[PDB]
CSV table of C-alpha atoms in Angstrom, one decimal:
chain,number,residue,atom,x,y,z
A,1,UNK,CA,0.0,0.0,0.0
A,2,UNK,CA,1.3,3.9,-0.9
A,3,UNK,CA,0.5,6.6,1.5
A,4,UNK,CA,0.1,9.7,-0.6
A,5,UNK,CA,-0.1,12.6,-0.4
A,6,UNK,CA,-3.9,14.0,-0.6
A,7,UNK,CA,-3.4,17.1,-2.3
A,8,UNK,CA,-2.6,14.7,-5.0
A,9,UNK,CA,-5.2,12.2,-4.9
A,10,UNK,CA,-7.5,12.3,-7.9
A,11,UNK,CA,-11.2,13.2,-8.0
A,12,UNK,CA,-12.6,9.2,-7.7
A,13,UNK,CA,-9.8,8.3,-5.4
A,14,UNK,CA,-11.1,11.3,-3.0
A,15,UNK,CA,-14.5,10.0,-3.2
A,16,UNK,CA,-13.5,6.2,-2.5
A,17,UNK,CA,-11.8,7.5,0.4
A,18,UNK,CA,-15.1,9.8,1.7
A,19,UNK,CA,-17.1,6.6,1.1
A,20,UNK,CA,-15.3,4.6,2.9
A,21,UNK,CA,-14.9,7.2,6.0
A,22,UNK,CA,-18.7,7.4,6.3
A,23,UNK,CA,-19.0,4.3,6.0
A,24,UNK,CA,-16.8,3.6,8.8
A,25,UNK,CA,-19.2,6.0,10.7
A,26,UNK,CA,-22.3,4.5,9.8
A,27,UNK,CA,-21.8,1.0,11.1
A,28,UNK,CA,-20.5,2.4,14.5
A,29,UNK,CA,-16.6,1.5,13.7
A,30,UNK,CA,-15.8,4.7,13.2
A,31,UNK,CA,-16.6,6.5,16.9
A,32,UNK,CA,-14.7,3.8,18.8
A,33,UNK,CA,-11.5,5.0,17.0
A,34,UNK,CA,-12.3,8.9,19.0
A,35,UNK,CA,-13.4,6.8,22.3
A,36,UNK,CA,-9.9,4.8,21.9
A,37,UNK,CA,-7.9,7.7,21.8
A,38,UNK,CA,-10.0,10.2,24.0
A,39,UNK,CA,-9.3,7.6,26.7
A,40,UNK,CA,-5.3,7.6,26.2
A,41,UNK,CA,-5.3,11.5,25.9
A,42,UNK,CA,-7.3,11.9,28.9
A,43,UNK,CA,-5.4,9.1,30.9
A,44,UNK,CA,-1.8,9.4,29.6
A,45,UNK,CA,0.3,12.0,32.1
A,46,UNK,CA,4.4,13.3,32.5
A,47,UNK,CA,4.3,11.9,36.0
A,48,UNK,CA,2.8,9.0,35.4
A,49,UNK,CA,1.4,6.0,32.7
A,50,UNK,CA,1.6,7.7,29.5
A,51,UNK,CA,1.9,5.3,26.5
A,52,UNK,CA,-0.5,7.3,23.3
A,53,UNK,CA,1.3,10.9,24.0
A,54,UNK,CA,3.9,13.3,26.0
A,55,UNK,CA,6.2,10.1,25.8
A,56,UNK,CA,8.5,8.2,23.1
A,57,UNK,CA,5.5,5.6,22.0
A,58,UNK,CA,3.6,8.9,20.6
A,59,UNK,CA,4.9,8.1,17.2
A,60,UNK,CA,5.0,3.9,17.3
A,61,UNK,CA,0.9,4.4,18.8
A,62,UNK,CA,-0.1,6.5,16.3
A,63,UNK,CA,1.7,4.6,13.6
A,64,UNK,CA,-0.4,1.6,15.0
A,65,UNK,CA,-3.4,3.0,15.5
A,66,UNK,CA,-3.2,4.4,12.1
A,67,UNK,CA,-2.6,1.3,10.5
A,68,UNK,CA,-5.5,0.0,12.5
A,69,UNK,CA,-8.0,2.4,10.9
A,70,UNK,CA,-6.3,2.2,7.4
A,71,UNK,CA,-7.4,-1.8,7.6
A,72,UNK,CA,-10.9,-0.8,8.7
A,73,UNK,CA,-10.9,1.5,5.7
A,74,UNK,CA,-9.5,-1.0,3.6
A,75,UNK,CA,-12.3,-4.0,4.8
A,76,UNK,CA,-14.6,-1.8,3.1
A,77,UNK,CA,-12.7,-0.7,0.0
A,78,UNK,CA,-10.0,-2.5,-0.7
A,79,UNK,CA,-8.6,0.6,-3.0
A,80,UNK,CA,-8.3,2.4,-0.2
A,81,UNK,CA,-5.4,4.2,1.8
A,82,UNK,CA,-5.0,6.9,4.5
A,83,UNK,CA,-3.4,10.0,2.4
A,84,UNK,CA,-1.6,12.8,4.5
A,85,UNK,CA,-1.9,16.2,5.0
A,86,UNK,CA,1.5,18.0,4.1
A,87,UNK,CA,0.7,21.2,6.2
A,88,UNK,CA,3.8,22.7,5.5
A,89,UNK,CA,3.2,23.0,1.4
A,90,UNK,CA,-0.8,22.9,2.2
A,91,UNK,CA,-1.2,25.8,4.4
A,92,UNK,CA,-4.1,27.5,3.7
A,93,UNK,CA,-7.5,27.8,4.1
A,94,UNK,CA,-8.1,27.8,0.3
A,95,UNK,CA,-6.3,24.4,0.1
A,96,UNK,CA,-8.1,21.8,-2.2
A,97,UNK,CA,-7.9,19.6,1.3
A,98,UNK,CA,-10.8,21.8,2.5
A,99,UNK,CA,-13.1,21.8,-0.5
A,100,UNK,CA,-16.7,20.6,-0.6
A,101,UNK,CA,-15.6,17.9,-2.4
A,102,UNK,CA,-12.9,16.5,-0.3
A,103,UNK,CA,-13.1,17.7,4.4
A,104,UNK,CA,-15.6,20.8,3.7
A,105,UNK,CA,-14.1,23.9,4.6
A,106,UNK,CA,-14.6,25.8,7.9
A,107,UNK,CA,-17.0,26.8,10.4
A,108,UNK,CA,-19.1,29.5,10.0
A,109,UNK,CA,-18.5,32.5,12.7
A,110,UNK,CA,-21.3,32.2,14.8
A,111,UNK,CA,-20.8,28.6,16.2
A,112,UNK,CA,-17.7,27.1,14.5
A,113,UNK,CA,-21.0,25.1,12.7
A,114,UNK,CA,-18.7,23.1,9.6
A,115,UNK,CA,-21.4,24.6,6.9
A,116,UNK,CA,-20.1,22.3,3.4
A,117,UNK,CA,-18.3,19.0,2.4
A,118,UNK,CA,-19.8,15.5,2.8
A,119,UNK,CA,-19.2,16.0,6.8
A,120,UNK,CA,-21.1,18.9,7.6
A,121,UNK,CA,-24.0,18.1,10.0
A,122,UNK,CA,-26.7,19.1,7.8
A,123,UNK,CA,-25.7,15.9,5.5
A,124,UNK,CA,-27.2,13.8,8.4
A,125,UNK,CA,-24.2,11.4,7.7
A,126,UNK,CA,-21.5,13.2,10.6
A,127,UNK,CA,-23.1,12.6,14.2
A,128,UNK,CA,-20.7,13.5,16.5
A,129,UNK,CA,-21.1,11.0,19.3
A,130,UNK,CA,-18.1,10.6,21.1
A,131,UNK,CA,-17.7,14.1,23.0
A,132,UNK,CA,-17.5,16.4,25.9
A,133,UNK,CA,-20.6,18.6,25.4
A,134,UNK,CA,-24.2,18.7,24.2
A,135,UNK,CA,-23.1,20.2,20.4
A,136,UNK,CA,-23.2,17.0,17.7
A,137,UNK,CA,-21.7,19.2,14.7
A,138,UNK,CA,-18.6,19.1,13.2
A,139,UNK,CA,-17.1,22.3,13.9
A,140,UNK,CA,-13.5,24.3,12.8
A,141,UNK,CA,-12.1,27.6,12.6
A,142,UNK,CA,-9.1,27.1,10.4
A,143,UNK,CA,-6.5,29.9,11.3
A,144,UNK,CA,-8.7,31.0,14.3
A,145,UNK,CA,-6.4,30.2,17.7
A,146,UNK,CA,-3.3,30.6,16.0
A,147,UNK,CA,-1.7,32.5,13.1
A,148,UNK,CA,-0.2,30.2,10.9
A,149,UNK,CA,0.7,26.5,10.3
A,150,UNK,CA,4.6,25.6,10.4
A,151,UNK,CA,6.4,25.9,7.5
A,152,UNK,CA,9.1,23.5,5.5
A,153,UNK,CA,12.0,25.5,7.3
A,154,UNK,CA,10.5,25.0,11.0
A,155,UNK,CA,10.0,21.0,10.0
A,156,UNK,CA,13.2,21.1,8.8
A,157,UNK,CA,14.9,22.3,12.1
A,158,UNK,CA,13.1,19.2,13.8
A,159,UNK,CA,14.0,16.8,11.4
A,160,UNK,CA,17.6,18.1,12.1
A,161,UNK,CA,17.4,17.4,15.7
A,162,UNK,CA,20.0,13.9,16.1
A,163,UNK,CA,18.1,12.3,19.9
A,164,UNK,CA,15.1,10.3,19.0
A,165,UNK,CA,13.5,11.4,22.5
A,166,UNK,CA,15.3,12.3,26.1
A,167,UNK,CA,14.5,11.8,29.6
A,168,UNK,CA,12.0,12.8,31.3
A,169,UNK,CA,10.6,11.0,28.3
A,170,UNK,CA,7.6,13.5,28.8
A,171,UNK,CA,6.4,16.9,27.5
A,172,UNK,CA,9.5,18.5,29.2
A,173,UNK,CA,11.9,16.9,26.9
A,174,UNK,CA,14.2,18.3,24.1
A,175,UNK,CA,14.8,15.9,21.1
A,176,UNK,CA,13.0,15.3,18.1
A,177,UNK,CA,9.8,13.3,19.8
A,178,UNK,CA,8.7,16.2,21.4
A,179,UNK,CA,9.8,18.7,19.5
A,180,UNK,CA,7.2,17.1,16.4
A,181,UNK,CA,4.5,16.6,19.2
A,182,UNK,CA,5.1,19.7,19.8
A,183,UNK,CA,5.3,20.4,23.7
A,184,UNK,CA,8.6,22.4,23.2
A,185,UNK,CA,9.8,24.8,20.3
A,186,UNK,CA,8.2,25.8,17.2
A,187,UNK,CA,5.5,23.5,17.9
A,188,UNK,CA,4.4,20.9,15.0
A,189,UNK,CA,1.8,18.5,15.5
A,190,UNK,CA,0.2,20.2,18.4
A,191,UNK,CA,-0.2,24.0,16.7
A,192,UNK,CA,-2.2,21.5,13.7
A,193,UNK,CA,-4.4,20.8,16.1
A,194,UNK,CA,-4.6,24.2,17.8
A,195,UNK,CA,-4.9,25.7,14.1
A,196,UNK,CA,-7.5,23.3,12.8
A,197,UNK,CA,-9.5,24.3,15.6
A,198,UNK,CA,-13.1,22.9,16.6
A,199,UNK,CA,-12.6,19.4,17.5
A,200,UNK,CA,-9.6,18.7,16.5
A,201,UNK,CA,-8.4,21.0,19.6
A,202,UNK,CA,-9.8,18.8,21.6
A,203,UNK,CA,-9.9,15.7,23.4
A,204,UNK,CA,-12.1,14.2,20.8
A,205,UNK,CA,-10.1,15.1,18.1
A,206,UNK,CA,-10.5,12.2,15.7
A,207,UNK,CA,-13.8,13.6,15.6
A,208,UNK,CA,-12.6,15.5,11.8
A,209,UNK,CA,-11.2,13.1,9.5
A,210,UNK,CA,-8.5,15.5,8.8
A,211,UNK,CA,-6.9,14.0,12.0
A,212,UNK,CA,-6.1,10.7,10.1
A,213,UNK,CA,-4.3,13.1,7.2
A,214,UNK,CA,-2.7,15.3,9.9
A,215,UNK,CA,-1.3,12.2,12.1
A,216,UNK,CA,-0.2,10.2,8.8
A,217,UNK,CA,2.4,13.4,7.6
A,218,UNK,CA,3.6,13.0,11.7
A,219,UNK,CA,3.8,9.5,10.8
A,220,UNK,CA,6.2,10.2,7.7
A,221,UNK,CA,8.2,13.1,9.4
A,222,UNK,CA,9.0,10.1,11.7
A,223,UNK,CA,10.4,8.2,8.7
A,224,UNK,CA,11.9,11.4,7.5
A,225,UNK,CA,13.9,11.7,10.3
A,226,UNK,CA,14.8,8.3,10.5
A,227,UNK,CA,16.6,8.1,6.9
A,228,UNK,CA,18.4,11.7,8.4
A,229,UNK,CA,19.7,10.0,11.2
A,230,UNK,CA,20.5,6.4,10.5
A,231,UNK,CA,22.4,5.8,13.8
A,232,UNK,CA,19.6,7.5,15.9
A,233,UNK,CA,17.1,5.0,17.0
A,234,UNK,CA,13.9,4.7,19.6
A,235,UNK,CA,14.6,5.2,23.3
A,236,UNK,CA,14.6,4.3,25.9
A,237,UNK,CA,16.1,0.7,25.2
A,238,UNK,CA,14.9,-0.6,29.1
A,239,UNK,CA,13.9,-0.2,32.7
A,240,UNK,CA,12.0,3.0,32.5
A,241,UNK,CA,9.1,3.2,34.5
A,242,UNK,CA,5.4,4.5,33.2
A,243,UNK,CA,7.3,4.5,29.8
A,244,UNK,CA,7.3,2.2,27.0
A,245,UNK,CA,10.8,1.0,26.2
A,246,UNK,CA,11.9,-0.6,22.7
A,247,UNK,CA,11.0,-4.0,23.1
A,248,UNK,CA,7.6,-3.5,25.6
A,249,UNK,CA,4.0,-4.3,24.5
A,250,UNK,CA,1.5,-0.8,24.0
A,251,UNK,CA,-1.7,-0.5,25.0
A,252,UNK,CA,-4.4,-1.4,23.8
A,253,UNK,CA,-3.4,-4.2,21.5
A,254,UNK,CA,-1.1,-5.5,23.8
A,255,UNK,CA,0.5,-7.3,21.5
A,256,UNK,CA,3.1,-4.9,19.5
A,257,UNK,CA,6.4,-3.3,20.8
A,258,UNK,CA,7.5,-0.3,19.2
A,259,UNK,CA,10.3,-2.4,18.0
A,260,UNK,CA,7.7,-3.8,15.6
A,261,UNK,CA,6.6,-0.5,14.3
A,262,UNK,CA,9.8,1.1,13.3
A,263,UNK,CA,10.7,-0.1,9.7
A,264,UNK,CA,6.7,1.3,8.3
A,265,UNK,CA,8.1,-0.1,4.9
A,266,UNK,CA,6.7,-3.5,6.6
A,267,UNK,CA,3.0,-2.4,5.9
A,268,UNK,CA,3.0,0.7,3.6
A,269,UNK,CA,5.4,3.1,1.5
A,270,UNK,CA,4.9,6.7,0.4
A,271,UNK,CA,4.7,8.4,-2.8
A,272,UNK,CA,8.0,9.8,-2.0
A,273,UNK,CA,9.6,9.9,1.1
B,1,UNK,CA,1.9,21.8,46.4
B,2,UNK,CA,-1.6,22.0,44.0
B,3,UNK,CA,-3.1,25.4,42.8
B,4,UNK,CA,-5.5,27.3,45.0
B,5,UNK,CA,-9.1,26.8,44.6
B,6,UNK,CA,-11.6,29.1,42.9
B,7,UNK,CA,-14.6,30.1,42.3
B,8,UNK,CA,-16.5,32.3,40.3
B,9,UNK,CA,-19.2,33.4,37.0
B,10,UNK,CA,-17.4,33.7,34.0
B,11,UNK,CA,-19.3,34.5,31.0
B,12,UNK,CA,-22.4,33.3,32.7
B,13,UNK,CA,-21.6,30.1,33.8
B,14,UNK,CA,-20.3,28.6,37.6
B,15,UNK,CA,-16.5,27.8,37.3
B,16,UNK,CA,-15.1,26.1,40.5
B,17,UNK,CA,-11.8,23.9,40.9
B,18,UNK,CA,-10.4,22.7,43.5
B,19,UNK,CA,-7.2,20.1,44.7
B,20,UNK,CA,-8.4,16.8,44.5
B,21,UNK,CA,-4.4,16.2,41.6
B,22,UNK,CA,-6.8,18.9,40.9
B,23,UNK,CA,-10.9,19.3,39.8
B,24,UNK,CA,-12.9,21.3,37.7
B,25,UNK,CA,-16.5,21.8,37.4
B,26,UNK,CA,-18.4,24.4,34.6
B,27,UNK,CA,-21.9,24.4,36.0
B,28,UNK,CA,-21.6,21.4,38.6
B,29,UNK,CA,-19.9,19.0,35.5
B,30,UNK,CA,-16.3,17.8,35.8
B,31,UNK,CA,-14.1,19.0,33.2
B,32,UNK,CA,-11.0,16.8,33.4
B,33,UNK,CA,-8.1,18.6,33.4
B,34,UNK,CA,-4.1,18.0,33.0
B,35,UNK,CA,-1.2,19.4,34.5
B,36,UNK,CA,2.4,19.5,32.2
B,37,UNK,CA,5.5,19.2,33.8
B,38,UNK,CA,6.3,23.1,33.2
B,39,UNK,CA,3.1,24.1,35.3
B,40,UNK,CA,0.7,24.8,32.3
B,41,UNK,CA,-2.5,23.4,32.1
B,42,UNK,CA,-5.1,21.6,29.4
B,43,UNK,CA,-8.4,20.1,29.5
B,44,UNK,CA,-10.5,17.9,27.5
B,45,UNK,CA,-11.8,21.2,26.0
B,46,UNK,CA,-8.3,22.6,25.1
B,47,UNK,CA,-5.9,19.6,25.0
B,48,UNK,CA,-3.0,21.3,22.7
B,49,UNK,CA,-3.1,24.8,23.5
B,50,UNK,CA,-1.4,24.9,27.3
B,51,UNK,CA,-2.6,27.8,29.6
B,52,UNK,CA,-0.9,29.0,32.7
B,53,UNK,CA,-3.5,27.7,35.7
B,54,UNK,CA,-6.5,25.3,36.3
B,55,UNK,CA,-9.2,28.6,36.3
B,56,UNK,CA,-7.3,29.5,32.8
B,57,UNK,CA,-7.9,25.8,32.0
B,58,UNK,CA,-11.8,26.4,32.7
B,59,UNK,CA,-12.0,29.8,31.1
B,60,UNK,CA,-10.9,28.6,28.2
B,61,UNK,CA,-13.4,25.4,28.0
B,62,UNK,CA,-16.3,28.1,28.7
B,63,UNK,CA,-14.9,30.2,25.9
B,64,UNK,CA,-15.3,27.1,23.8
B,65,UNK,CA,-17.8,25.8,24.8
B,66,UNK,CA,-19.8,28.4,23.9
B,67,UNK,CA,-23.0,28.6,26.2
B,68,UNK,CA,-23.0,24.5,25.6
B,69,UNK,CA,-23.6,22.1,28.4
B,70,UNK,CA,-20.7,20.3,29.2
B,71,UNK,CA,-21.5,16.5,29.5
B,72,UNK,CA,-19.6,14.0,32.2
């Protein structure tokens, strides 16, 4: 399976991928994917368990948990794959990402209300279930809580950054885990989610599909960075406590180590990487 | 040693916290809440957007929220 990039996706591969999102949503699947990770971002913590974020397994759990959802997607067409949203190149609100005919755009003013695109609420086909409030719209304010998404040159001084992830292991480190996750510095993935606004600032962020798009480019600035540093690998390599070392089983599946998620080449490439 | 408690109306609607770590109710409903290592503060609301103190934490879920009820 290629990952590409969506911006380049053509018109029936967009719809493929729509129909197989609401899909996904209709049967039920799709809102156990927000409970899953609702209940790691609320339970995760620096001082304490934290396996889904704030620690090194932010990028091995969100490769899995990715993969789990592209197979989802892929049970109910095969064509299928998750494409990613290259917010450095695609950075504004114009973007073909956020046309009708693709996520819909952004919320109108007076309620964040997501007003176009096969989402909106007023399809009847985007119930938001899983959340913290009485509102069951998808809503967004692109560009609303902060000024801009990161550019090529910011992603560029992470990639550059040699430590895979440093103790505390939590959002007080420097290396490159946290530095993408954005909890120190110029702030990547986190100042997406801040920018996208609506639920995607939330805890029930995989609410918008764009968090699937969003999380796969993480997922290939991960691989990015590995091919940068080929003598820079996951850490911690053993005995750290609430953390997940190289060779320890994740949560949920229980059965997968990071070790088994760093080579992605096992289960997909991308169109370039 | 936690934050201080609070109490007060902020754009219409009861915000209370209170050391438990730490609590935080928006019209009698919990709003869980997070401390980071550096002292800032998210919630469920706001998750990647860190403010300075649990009653920023709730401010900003009202200012969300806009006049919705949160749910438990």
């Amino acid at each position: 399976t290629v990952r590409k990039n969506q911006a380049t996706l053509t018109a029936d591969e967009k719809r493929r991928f729509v129909a197989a999102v609401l899909e996904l949503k209709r049967s039920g699947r799709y809102d156990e994917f927000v409970r899953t990770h609702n209940e790691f971002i609320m339970s995760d913590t620096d001082s304490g368990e934290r396996t889904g974020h704030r620690s090194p397994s932010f990028l091995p759990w969100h490769r899995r948990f990715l993969l789990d959802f592209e197979q989802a997607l892929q049970s109910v067409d095969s064509s299928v794959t998750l494409p990613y949203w290259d917010w450095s190149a695609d950075r504004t609100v114009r973007a073909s990402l956020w046309a009708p005919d693709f996520l819909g755009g952004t919320g109108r003013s007076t309620d964040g209300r997501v007003m176009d695109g096969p989402f909106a609420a007023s399809t009847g086909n985007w119930p938001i279930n899983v959340r913290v409030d009485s509102r069951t719209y998808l809503r967004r304010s692109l560009g609303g809580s902060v000024a801009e998404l990161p550019t090529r040159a910011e992603v560029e001084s992470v990639l550059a950054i040699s430590a895979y992830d440093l103790p505390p292991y939590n959002s007080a480190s420097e290396g490159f885990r946290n530095h993408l996750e954005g909890w120190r510095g110029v702030n990547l993935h986190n100042r997406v989610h801040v920018w996208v606004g609506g639920q995607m600032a939330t805890g029930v962020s995989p609410n918008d599909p764009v968090f699937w798009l969003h999380h796969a480019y993480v997922d290939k600035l991960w691989a990015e960075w590995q091919r940068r540093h080929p003598d820079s690998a996951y850490v911690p390599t053993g005995g750290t406590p609430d953390v997940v070392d190289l060779n320890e089983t994740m949560k949920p599946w229980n059965t997968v180590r990071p070790a088994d998620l760093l080579d992605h080449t096992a289960y997909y490439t991308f169109d370039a990487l | 040693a936690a934050p201080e408690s609070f109490d007060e109306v902020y754009k219409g609607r009861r915000i209370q916290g209170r050391p438990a770590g730490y609590e935080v109710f928006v019209d009698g409903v919990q709003l869980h809440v997070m401390r980071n290592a550096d002292g800032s503060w998210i919630s469920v609301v706001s998750h990647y957007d860190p403010v300075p103190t649990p009653r920023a934490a709730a401010r900003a879920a009202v200012d969300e929220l806009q006049g919705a009820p949160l749910l438990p």
